[PDB]
Amino acid sequence: IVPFIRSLLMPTTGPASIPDDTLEKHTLRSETSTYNLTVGDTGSGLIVFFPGFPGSIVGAHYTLQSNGNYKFDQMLLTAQNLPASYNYCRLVSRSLTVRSSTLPGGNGTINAVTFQGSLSELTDVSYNGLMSATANINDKIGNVLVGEGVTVLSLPTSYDLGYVRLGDPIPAIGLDPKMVATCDSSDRPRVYTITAADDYQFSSQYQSGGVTITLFSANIDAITSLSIGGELVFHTSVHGLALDATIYLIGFDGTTVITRAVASDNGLTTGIDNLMPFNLVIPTNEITQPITSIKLEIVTSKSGGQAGDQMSWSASGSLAVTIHGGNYPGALRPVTLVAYERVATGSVVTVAGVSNFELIPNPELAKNLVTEYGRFDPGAMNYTKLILSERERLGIKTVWPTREYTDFREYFM
Amino acid sequence: VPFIRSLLMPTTGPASIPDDTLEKHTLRSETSTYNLTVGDTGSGLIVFFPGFPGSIVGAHYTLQSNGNYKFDQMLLTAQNLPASYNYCRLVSRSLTVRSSTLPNGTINAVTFQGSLSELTDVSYNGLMSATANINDKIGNVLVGEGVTVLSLPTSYDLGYVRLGDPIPAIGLDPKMVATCDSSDRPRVYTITAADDYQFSSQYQSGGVTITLFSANIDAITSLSIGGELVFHTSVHGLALDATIYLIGFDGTTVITRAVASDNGLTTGIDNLMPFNLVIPTNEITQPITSIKLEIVTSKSGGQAGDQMSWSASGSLAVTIHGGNYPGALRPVTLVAYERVATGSVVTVAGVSNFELIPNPELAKNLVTEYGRFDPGAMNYTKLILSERERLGIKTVWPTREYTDFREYFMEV
Amino acid sequence: IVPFIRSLLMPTTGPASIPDDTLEKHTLRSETSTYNLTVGDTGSGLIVFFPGFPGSIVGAHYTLQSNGNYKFDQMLLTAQNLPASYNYCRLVSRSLTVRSSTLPLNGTINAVTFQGSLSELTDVSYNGLMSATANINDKIGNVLVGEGVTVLSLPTSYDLGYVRLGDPIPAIGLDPKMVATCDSSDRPRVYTITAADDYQFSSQYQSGGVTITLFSANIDAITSLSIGGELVFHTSVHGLALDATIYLIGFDGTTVITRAVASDNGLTTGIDNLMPFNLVIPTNEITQPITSIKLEIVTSKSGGQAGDQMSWSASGSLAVTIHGGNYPGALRPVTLVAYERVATGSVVTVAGVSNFELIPNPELAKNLVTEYGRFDPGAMNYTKLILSERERLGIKTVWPTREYTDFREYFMEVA
Amino acid sequence: IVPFIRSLLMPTTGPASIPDDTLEKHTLRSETSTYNLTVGDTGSGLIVFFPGFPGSIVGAHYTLQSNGNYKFDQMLLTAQNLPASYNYCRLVSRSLTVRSSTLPLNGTINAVTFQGSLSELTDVSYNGLMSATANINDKIGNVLVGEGVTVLSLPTSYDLGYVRLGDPIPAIGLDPKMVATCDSSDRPRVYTITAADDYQFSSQYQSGGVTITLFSANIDAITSLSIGGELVFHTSVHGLALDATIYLIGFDGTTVITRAVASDNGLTTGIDNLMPFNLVIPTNEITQPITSIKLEIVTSKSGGQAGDQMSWSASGSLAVTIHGGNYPGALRPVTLVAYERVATGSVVTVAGVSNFELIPNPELAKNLVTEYGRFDPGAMNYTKLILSERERLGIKTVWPTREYTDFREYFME
Ligand SMILES: [Ca+2]
Numbered sequence A: 001i002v003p004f005i006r007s008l009l010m011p012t013t014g015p016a017s018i019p020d021d022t023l024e025k026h027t028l029r030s031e032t033s034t035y036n037l038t039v040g041d042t043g044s045g046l047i048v049f050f051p052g053f054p055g056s057i058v059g060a061h062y063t064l065q066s067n068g069n070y071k072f073d074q075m076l077l078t079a080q081n082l083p084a085s086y087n088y089c090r091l092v093s094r095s096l097t098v099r100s101s102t103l104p105g106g107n108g109t110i111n112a113v114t115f116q117g118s119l120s121e122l123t124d125v126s127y128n129g130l131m132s133a134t135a136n137i138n139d140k141i142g143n144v145l146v147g148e149g150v151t152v153l154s155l156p157t158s159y160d161l162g163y164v165r166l167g168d169p170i171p172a173i174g175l176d177p178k179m180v181a182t183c184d185s186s187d188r189p190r191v192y193t194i195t196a197a198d199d200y201q202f203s204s205q206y207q208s209g210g211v212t213i214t215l216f217s218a219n220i221d222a223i224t225s226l227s228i229g230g231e232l233v234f235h236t237s238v239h240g241l242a243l244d245a246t247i248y249l250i251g252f253d254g255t256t257v258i259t260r261a262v263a264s265d266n267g268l269t270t271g272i273d274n275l276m277p278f279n280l281v282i283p284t285n286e287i288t289q290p291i292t293s294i295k296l297e298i299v300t301s302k303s304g305g306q307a308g309d310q311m312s313w314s315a316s317g318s319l320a321v322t323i324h325g326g327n328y329p330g331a332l333r334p335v336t337l338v339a340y341e342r343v344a345t346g347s348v349v350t351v352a353g354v355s356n357f358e359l360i361p362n363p364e365l366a367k368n369l370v371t372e373y374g375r376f377d378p379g380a381m382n383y384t385k386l387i388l389s390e391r392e393r394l395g396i397k398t399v400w401p402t403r404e405y406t407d408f409r410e411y412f413m
Numbered sequence B: 001v002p003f004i005r006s007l008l009m010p011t012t013g014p015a016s017i018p019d020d021t022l023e024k025h026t027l028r029s030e031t032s033t034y035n036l037t038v039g040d041t042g043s044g045l046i047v048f049f050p051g052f053p054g055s056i057v058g059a060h061y062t063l064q065s066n067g068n069y070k071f072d073q074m075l076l077t078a079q080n081l082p083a084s085y086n087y088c089r090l091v092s093r094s095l096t097v098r099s100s101t102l103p104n105g106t107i108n109a110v111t112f113q114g115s116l117s118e119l120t121d122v123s124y125n126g127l128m129s130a131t132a133n134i135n136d137k138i139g140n141v142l143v144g145e146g147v148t149v150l151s152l153p154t155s156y157d158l159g160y161v162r163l164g165d166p167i168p169a170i171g172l173d174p175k176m177v178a179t180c181d182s183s184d185r186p187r188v189y190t191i192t193a194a195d196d197y198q199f200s201s202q203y204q205s206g207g208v209t210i211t212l213f214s215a216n217i218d219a220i221t222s223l224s225i226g227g228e229l230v231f232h233t234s235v236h237g238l239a240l241d242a243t244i245y246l247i248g249f250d251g252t253t254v255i256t257r258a259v260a261s262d263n264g265l266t267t268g269i270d271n272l273m274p275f276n277l278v279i280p281t282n283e284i285t286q287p288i289t290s291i292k293l294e295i296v297t298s299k300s301g302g303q304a305g306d307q308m309s310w311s312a313s314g315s316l317a318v319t320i321h322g323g324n325y326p327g328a329l330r331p332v333t334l335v336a337y338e339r340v341a342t343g344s345v346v347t348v349a350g351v352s353n354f355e356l357i358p359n360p361e362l363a364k365n366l367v368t369e370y371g372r373f374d375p376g377a378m379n380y381t382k383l384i385l386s387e388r389e390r391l392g393i394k395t396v397w398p399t400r401e402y403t404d405f406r407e408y409f410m411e412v
Numbered sequence C: 001i002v003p004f005i006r007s008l009l010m011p012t013t014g015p016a017s018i019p020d021d022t023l024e025k026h027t028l029r030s031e032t033s034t035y036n037l038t039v040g041d042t043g044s045g046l047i048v049f050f051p052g053f054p055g056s057i058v059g060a061h062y063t064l065q066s067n068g069n070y071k072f073d074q075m076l077l078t079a080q081n082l083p084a085s086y087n088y089c090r091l092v093s094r095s096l097t098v099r100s101s102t103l104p105l106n107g108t109i110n111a112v113t114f115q116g117s118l119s120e121l122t123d124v125s126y127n128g129l130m131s132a133t134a135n136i137n138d139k140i141g142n143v144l145v146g147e148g149v150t151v152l153s154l155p156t157s158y159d160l161g162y163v164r165l166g167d168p169i170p171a172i173g174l175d176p177k178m179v180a181t182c183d184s185s186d187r188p189r190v191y192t193i194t195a196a197d198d199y200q201f202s203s204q205y206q207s208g209g210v211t212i213t214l215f216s217a218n219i220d221a222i223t224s225l226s227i228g229g230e231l232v233f234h235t236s237v238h239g240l241a242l243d244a245t246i247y248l249i250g251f252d253g254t255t256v257i258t259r260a261v262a263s264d265n266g267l268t269t270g271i272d273n274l275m276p277f278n279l280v281i282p283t284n285e286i287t288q289p290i291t292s293i294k295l296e297i298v299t300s301k302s303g304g305q306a307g308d309q310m311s312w313s314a315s316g317s318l319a320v321t322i323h324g325g326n327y328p329g330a331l332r333p334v335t336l337v338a339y340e341r342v343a344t345g346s347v348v349t350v351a352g353v354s355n356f357e358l359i360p361n362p363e364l365a366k367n368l369v370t371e372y373g374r375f376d377p378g379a380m381n382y383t384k385l386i387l388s389e390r391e392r393l394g395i396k397t398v399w400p401t402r403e404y405t406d407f408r409e410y411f412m413e414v415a
Numbered sequence D: 001i002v003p004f005i006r007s008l009l010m011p012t013t014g015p016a017s018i019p020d021d022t023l024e025k026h027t028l029r030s031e032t033s034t035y036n037l038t039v040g041d042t043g044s045g046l047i048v049f050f051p052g053f054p055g056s057i058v059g060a061h062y063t064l065q066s067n068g069n070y071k072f073d074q075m076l077l078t079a080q081n082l083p084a085s086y087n088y089c090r091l092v093s094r095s096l097t098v099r100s101s102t103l104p105l106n107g108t109i110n111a112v113t114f115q116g117s118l119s120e121l122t123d124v125s126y127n128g129l130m131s132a133t134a135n136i137n138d139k140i141g142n143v144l145v146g147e148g149v150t151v152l153s154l155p156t157s158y159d160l161g162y163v164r165l166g167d168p169i170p171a172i173g174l175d176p177k178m179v180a181t182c183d184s185s186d187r188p189r190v191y192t193i194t195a196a197d198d199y200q201f202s203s204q205y206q207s208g209g210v211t212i213t214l215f216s217a218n219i220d221a222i223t224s225l226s227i228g229g230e231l232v233f234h235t236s237v238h239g240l241a242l243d244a245t246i247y248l249i250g251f252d253g254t255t256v257i258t259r260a261v262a263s264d265n266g267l268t269t270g271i272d273n274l275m276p277f278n279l280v281i282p283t284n285e286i287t288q289p290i291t292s293i294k295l296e297i298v299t300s301k302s303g304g305q306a307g308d309q310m311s312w313s314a315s316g317s318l319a320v321t322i323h324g325g326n327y328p329g330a331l332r333p334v335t336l337v338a339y340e341r342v343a344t345g346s347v348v349t350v351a352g353v354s355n356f357e358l359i360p361n362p363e364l365a366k367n368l369v370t371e372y373g374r375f376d377p378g379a380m381n382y383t384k385l386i387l388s389e390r391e392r393l394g395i396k397t398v399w400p401t402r403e404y405t406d407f408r409e410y411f412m413e
């Protein structure tokens, strides 16, 4: 059969060019992913996969703790870091399997679902709640035995997608040995607009150390670089007030991933528009785990203050959070969650997969890597469209009990 | 071929676009129904955004005796799509405009390939020249018979657009608003407001105000304004106040933002005035068609004779989020009416068809799919459009003719 | 051409037997509906149709008042009252047109077919109606009143049973106002209201008893219903007595039926005080469609001390049974035709036809022959094919009359 | 291949419209069911399934206790609560698998499909179940728990009407605990109990009153029901008062619901003393399936003293109405899956799919399109043919999972 269809439904067989109209000279590659994750003491956990991610980020593993909160374990990537060798990329196909491979010195089920939004948009991430994230029967699978395993297959979220910049490093020199410079995924940014205050009235008695408040908290999604811009305007009738403002980017496990000062001892002048601008740039290397929320903290203070003293101000303002390349299909959505429970503590949950890409090499590699437009295959796209339209009749799933996927592979070959 | 049917006869329902943008989606039809009231001049203008990917369908303006237009209201779909969906693509759309009441009149309509503020003439007769395409203009149709606006493609293989849906958020402010906006394909305007511009004037209690510039730009949904102005001065004690105004098609101020407040200028130094503005969609009450910057110069302890002066250089960048997404700002279809009896009702009725992706809550009960495979649908669409002139497929029609066209199609 | 499809799509042509498996000896009849309704001073109104109603009730007309409330005008029925001549019935097909016929261009109509019953609509405004359904072929907007709209009844299931019509039964009584009927009953609709689950009431007295509305709920009824169940009261205060009244409210907010449930029911301390509901509301008492039910309870202590604390705790569930209410077409679906900007005093004209399968009452049976009805081998499959291609064929439940007329021509040519 | 037959025999592949004459505009949905049940200390238990239930109730789990009694564990439902989003429903197809997934080889399963409702079973022991039916294709014995059993729902009539889901209706009340719904009602089941026909009661006084259980009867209820009727009492003795209570008992012997029918009802001599029944038991109050009803009557003599005679004669009938009880699938049939010898603490995993034809509630109707559904000329005939050849084809209601799997292959080819 058509090579692309083969690649699409059976990624582990290798790559093939997407039969669309995005004619770029490129090269084809397969990157494997292999992880042996350890089960925590509740025997429950969650793996978040970004099936359509155009690059080396495959997912993240979280363990569920006794207190009911998740805790970040680690990212799941490809064998090598693509940005080190390539500058542009497009995802061709991908599949990963998750199954237990071990038992601790002398158990378990999986629920999985493919959600059409991004991580922070899920309304329920519990083992059982997941089963309702989507209404599509072929995008959910329940109570599969961990030992048999589940297979996650990436299905398209649009074709004729452009190539994505990989966040490759660029030629640069600096005084700081820690300096970092890259060209990021940017085309198709996602933008969140937050009006944190519209004549919001703040009022409180002085207090040594200042009074702190969290003006707002909002769910947003970010895996790679983002920028935060905009401004808050403050009004006050009180003399001697100074502000300290800090933005926090929170991870899926509730921990603080990034903190940035926005205002430091910003004094407020009476009867005037006090401007507090935001000029934040958060680079990818600082994001240690997926960001799922953003909150603003403001600390109001008065230097020569006394117990009882009045500190008050009114504020108005909007921020814009720009996730570079955030709306590129596959970059933040969709998400495939694989949850496991009742697995013996200390067991090994093994992840193994392949990702196939269309790539454009970086300058150094371009000297030795030939690139081409790729096999003309007249009916490949029509066939793909036919297959996907008949998705329900053919039973092509995004999540499968591995045994069934294997049977499906035979019935295909 | 369902797509062709939906495209040319939107009121029959939606169909998936036969392109290569394969996303699991659902198909929906949203109606638009309005009974607009005719002002005392008997003249008015309806501005339609034929390709708008979402719930905004147009805006109504009445023409006043003084010759200026006055904003009436927005024209939307029956329900607010962003409340139920996160992503969208326009499949097809058509709207009819005709008089339904007597308490007379004609219509001129045209489809302009730019955005609203780019039109050079918006008068009832002037519109007839906005385009050279005979199939994109229609003149003096009787208001009682009506006109039909049909949405024709401005590119396929367009991506799904974020709808400006609300995101989960909690804040101390009850008026707090948080959304994920239409962003892909931003439109960017760059304005160099000053390049060593010399300002000079004699003191004056209260300060001296100048409008540094005024420019035409278009915006319906969120936008941001960044950049900076740099000021130089040899005079001591000067302070600046600067404000940005976003103006509506009717000349009214829609939005004001302080950019500088009592910003004092130091001598022999680069005085920086940054712009960090974000204008959310909920604040835009009517389409924005221009932007202007105001600077007020002042000297606190000054006396007559004192000379106020500074030199400035600087550039701003106005980013209209998702502004260049085809259909978001351009094209525009204008339907103008005149000589209609005052107090009459101009009735608008239409259908909008979309490919949509449900929000998280609705996704729990709404099944999404890739959509019928129809091998020759795109080729047939391309053939029809290339023979557009020979087939007479218009973007604006005298309704009677559109109706005949519908019959001649269902019988072919 | 298959008579049934012809009847279904063009009801005014006459009846035909439903090609299903409900083989009963019956007769076929057509009842017309004709009304000249008057437009109120706001120029806005609403006609509610019960497109699938198995009997003579076609709809109800309401005018919109200056204050924003609707006001009941009258019921729309068939030329004759079917229950007076027949005992059983099945709806075959039905169509109605609504248009302005007089002048004292003066108006628009929005119409929609909702898959629930009247009280379940979330928005009944002229423009809100456009969203009641997502089906593009079950809604129509801003049609000129002079051209008009056509309501076409599409099936909500076949192989439906015959419905009892609410015919009079032989009876004699001392009361001249006595009424006895055999009612539509198969497939009742049942609403269960747990009005209170240890609800705590405590109120200051007030002359005449402190009155509260324990609860209010949306329910639908056009014909007889019964209300059963019981409330159990507990109290530590002596001398309290309760008055309870069930109220059945119309779509216009007016009280349609009121029934005493408790009258001077005294409450004994430290004991389960029982308040049973044994209500039967007969069809002839319902003057307009019911859209809500409320329980008013008046608590009184024997003294009469303005301000005297009153208290009791209550628990209970009531069951509201709408006889035959779940029979498809009896309460759902509903087709609403709203009009606005019509000149005050104009006449909105309604004209239609209802087709039925009927079983005559005893007296008429002596002269009306009944039969099983034409065998037509492919009629049901043809129907199913047509309905499954409903969107492709554009078969609507609401149409701009001009289009429906074109559709009829396009049909009589092929056949 | 007929989608409907595919759905019917292989529910996990998704829904299809029933090819009968109930032509309603509807939508099609699949709801999964996933449960990890824990085995008690006897290593024995019972799962009761309602294979044809038109809605979200799939079944109930009971553990067998050392004393030989069952104990209710929990209900087994679909992933989401259908009555919250839809108002009407029809069951298209359904299948569930039951197998052990953990070990802290242990155990066997016996399963049977009984044509009555739960309380009508004459024997619910692990081995007794094998006789509940004579149909060889509706019973299966000693399947290993590790391999598992598959319950397949087979029709109990077509051309069934849509069922009201017990959805909430718009209502407001003084009580925050107020509940109001439109219940499954078409085709009610009615039990008529003549509790007494001039029954003579006589007993010596006792401080506290004398208690008797006039009668006890097996009835079945899962959702709302009402009890009506009346008892008439006669007596020659002065000063007697009665207390009467109705108790609705669960399958495990526990009291699920209690209602006072008479409280301090005094008896007047030489007159007909009326004791009406006006009970309405809403669904939310039924915590587990009801399998019996009993009436308790406490006779007391106010000014009574030791030695006092107490007596009365009674006559009466009650009518218990189970709303929608006789709708095929609502109470009957029932499929019982029993397991024994399973290691205590093991997990018995349940995983299934339910397919429905539904009508959305008013809010969802604004965004969910409904249709009549694919015309498929021979689907019904093919279904009738298949079912008539049920024995020859070996189409079972309960299967050893391995065989069901083979059956699926033999069908897809
Ligand atoms: Ca393309």
Ligand SMILES: [Ca+2]
Residues within 6 Å of the ligand: C020, C021, C159, D020, D021, D159
């Ligand atoms: Ca039948």
